[PDB]
Amino acid sequence: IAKINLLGGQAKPGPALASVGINMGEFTKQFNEKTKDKQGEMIPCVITAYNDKSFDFILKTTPVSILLKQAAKLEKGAKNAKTIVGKITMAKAKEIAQYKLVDLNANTVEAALKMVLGTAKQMGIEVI
Amino acid sequence: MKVRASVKPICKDCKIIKRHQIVRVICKTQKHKQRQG
Amino acid sequence: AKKDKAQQVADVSHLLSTSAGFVIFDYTSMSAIEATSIRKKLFKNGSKIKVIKNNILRRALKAGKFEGIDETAIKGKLAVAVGVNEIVETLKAVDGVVKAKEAMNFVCGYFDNRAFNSADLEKIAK
Amino acid sequence: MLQPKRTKYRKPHNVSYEGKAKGNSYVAFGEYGLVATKGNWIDARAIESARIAISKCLGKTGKMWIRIFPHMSKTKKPLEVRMGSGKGNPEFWVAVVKQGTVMFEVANIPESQMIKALTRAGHKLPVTWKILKREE
Amino acid sequence: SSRRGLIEGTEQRDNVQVIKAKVPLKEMFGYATDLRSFSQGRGNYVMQFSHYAETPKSVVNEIIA
Amino acid sequence: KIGNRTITLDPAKVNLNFQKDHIAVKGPLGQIELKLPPNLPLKFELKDNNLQITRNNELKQSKIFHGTYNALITNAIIGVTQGFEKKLRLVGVGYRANVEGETLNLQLGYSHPIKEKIPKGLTVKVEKNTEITISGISKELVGQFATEVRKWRKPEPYKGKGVLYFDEVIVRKAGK
Amino acid sequence: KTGANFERSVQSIQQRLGVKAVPIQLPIGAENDFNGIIDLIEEKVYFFDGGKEEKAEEKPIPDQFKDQV
RNA sequence: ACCUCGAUGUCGACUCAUCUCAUCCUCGAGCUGAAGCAGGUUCGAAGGGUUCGGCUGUUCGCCGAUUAAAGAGAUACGUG
RNA sequence: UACUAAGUGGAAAAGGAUGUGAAAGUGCUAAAACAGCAAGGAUGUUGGCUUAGAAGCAGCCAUCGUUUAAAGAGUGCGUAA
């Protein structure tokens, strides 16, 4: 419900952030305070029905998408998915999979790495 | 109803029935009603 | 194919005969998200939360020497946890599922191939 | 225009098209084709119209061949003259079709757009259409 | 949607949704009064000149023919 | 396939009168007298505890016949054992309706008084001045009455305004 | 005129405006039967006519309204 | 070129009109990019109605003003 | 002995026909087949971009993958989001 792709900074300027009945600042305070660690870095945001949308939230462990962007060594948007640009290897693939080791609900190294390739071969890098 | 002499399924839910030996169609789409197929 | 149906029935008969413990409890709405939550909890357990047809589970059970002829006529979504290789932790998880629903009646199965009353099997589970 | 280079006579006997297909009795180049259930006259204007219609629906990679081409002439008297002073002046060009004759073939084109083009051709010819495939 | 457009989402100033519109001035005249008509006057619009952009062929028709 | 379907029965709540001219099912929730014309291909059996009517002949019109007679048997059984009810909302600004004795009034765009008589075997109940409930023993008659009430007003896209069937979310059009 | 009710009006203003205002009177009728005004701090006034309004007298409430008053 | 050329009385106007519906209007109804009015679409329905003046012999046509409405036609392009 | 539910018979172009029989092939299948219904339908993922704002359905490059009976950048409906 209302997937939210926002940084770790201000939770005020999100129009789709407050659409299920939740207010803006009442969480934004603690959101900023506890996400000052990675302010300027993305932190995905989703929500579930609490009882009446008085206050609820859940922050997601970051999937490798900004690190997967620099895995291609390009800071430009990837409208070219069949082009293998950037270097990724089993060592780097496993390092990336460490991030998503807890991020996914099916737990095993090979399958999580297959997730990383499947999301990454379409990233704009035909990964190893 | 649309005055024509050859009607074929034009929306995905335009199904053809024959009422009293007059061929007509039924569909949710209201721009797709016609008879005398 | 019907011959394929028979050979699959034989294969799952062999599977249940080989497997000592196994529990199949009918779920309303067995949910995939909480299913893979179970999968994280089970991890590399010999158990495999799985979903196969309910008629094959009749003829599997009636080929594979386990008690109950009218106990197989369950109606609805059925998923079997084959308890083995940490069968206890599988029992723990399936009783956690028992407490995750309204109240799920004992359909079939037991800890290691000897079914009895289910007022204590859940206590082995927790 | 589909006007032949030269004609020995401007004022010929057209055809007796009540007979089985003399030539072009089967598709030769493409994989599917339109065939006439019976024979009749066709002008040149409608041949050009059918060609352009099938070409608009033709892909940039598909190719199409025509079998029947205007060889005969067609004459009409003015609407003020009584019966018989001579023979008038030819107006336009006409080709003959025998029963079972094929006229259009398409190739290097998807089969769905193939049947699309065949329907487009059929909706424009007075002769009754029928659809076949390249047998060999 | 019909005037070179800015309909690519929503922009909000944290309590008021201010939407940008890079719109040619020729298409402002009936635009603003009809926007007030349709919106029941519950909004407004600010006068700021963006830039000198390309003229559409509709206005080019009167250049030469 | 609808052929000799399983139609359950409890021969104490409702009693049956199976005749070649009228089928009379009677119980505490009234009686239903299904009228069936003479010269029918179907044969009726004296049965209880899931009565089933079989087919003596196999042909298209007879097939449709059996399907429809079985469906109407189901309809009449559930009617005589449970009854039928329909409910209709009325979405408007000044629209309303209420009851006088056995007649439903209507307040509509009409500047002229509108009342409609209630057919026999059915009863109306008012809970809010616009939404009405009609309860009787026949789905046939209750639907006919619902259409009769609807016939005076049709919902339109530019504004929620009409005889809503409690579950119809109509398409919307945005003019002015 | 059609489309109005005193309770409806005060409810609408309370929700959409946050007016937090106080009523003084209560019309009698729904949309056409406006022939008297219940008064809250004092007695209801019954209007003997329509678009004339020249004879105003303040008559006792029948208790189906005075309790809510 | 087929009866009527040992007689078929052929334009136009007045009057009398009768009939058809591919309906001009009143009528029913659907649909709409049908806010509403104001619109278009065609299915039914021929029950009824379906003007007055200027112009040149007039049909045609144009014009003037005007009606809920200022039809297309058939009847020796109606009626000596 | 078959067809017609069209008074076809007892007139006819183009096209349309899920009207209906007969014929020769032809998939599943009492182990539930075909529906409809009772239930899930996950997951990187609002894949990457775009227009500050487009992010399963504005659109383009991809259009691949884990758990799994299966889950599709989704089958369509919903907003500029």
Curated annotation (Swiss-Prot), chain B:
Name assigned to this protein = Large ribosomal subunit protein bL36
Q: Which organism is the protein's source?
A: Mycoplasma pneumoniae (strain ATCC 29342 / M129 / Subtype 1) (Mycoplasmoides pneumoniae)
Record keywords, A-Z: Ribonucleoprotein, Ribosomal protein
Gene for this chain: rpmJ
Q: Name one GO cellular component term.
A: ribosome
Question: What's one Pfam family the UniProt record gives for this protein?
Answer: Ribosomal_L36
Is Ribosomal protein among the key words of this record? yes
Indicate the family of this protein.
Answer: Belongs to the bacterial ribosomal protein bL36 family.
Against SUPFAM superfamilies, the record matches this protein to: Ribosomal protein L36
Q: Name one GO molecular function term.
A: structural constituent of ribosome
In its UniProt record, which GO terms are filed under biological process? translation
Name the PROSITE patterns on file.
Answer: RIBOSOMAL_L36
Curated annotation (Swiss-Prot), chain C:
Task: Note whether Manganese occurs among the keywords.
Answer: no
Question: What biological processes does GO assign it?
Answer: translation
Q: Which domain of life is it from?
A: Bacteria
Q: Which GO terms describe its molecular function?
A: large ribosomal subunit rRNA binding; structural constituent of ribosome
Q: Which UniProt keywords apply?
A: Ribonucleoprotein, Ribosomal protein, RNA-binding, rRNA-binding
- Which cellular component terms (GO) are annotated to the entry? large ribosomal subunit
- Describe the subunit structure: Part of the ribosomal stalk of the 50S ribosomal subunit. The N-terminus interacts with L11 and the large rRNA to form the base of the stalk. The C-terminus forms an elongated spine to which L12 dimers bind in a sequential fashion forming a multimeric L10(L12)X complex.
**What job does the chain carry out?**
Forms part of the ribosomal stalk, playing a central role in the interaction of the ribosome with GTP-bound translation factors.
Family recorded in the similarity comment: Belongs to the universal ribosomal protein uL10 family.
Name recorded for this polypeptide: Large ribosomal subunit protein uL10
User: What organism is this sequence from?
Assistant: Mycoplasma pneumoniae (strain ATCC 29342 / M129 / Subtype 1) (Mycoplasmoides pneumoniae)
The organism that produces this protein has a lineage beginning with: Bacteria, Bacillati, Mycoplasmatota, Mycoplasmoidales, Mycoplasmoidaceae
From the entire protein, which fragment is shown? 3 to 128 of 161
Curated annotation (Swiss-Prot), chain E:
Report the locations given in the UniProt record: Cytoplasm
Recorded family membership: Belongs to the TRAFAC class translation factor GTPase superfamily. Classic translation factor GTPase family. EF-G/EF-2 subfamily.
Its biological purpose is as follows:
Catalyzes the GTP-dependent ribosomal translocation step during translation elongation. During this step, the ribosome changes from the pre-translocational (PRE) to the post-translocational (POST) state as the newly formed A-site-bound peptidyl-tRNA and P-site-bound deacylated tRNA move to the P and E sites, respectively. Catalyzes the coordinated movement of the two tRNA molecules, the mRNA and conformational changes in the ribosome.
Which named protein is this? Elongation factor G
Q: Which organism is it from?
A: Mycoplasma pneumoniae (strain ATCC 29342 / M129 / Subtype 1) (Mycoplasmoides pneumoniae)
Swiss-Prot record, chain F:
In terms of InterPro entries, this protein maps to: Ribosomal_uL6-like (IPR000702), Ribosomal_uL6-like_a/b-dom_sf (IPR036789), Ribosomal_uL6_a/b-dom (IPR020040), Ribosomal_uL6_bac-type (IPR019906), Ribosomal_uL6_CS (IPR002358)
Q: Which GO terms describe its cellular component?
A: cytosolic large ribosomal subunit
Keyword Signal belongs to the record: no
- Is Ribonucleoprotein included in the keywords of this UniProt record? yes
One biological process term from GO is: cytoplasmic translation
Q: In the record, what terms sit under GO molecular function?
A: rRNA binding; structural constituent of ribosome
List UniProt keywords, sorted A-Z: Ribonucleoprotein, Ribosomal protein, RNA-binding, rRNA-binding
Q: What does this protein do?
A: This protein binds to the 23S rRNA, and is important in its secondary structure. It is located near the subunit interface in the base of the L7/L12 stalk, and near the tRNA binding site of the peptidyltransferase center.
Q: Which PANTHER family match?
A: 60S/50S RIBOSOMAL PROTEIN L6/L9 (PTHR11655), LARGE RIBOSOMAL SUBUNIT PROTEIN UL6M (PTHR11655:SF14)
**Quaternary structure, from the entry:** Part of the 50S ribosomal subunit.
So what family is this one in? Belongs to the universal ribosomal protein uL6 family.
Q: What is this protein called?
A: Large ribosomal subunit protein uL6
Upper taxonomic lineage: Bacteria, Bacillati, Mycoplasmatota, Mycoplasmoidales, Mycoplasmoidaceae
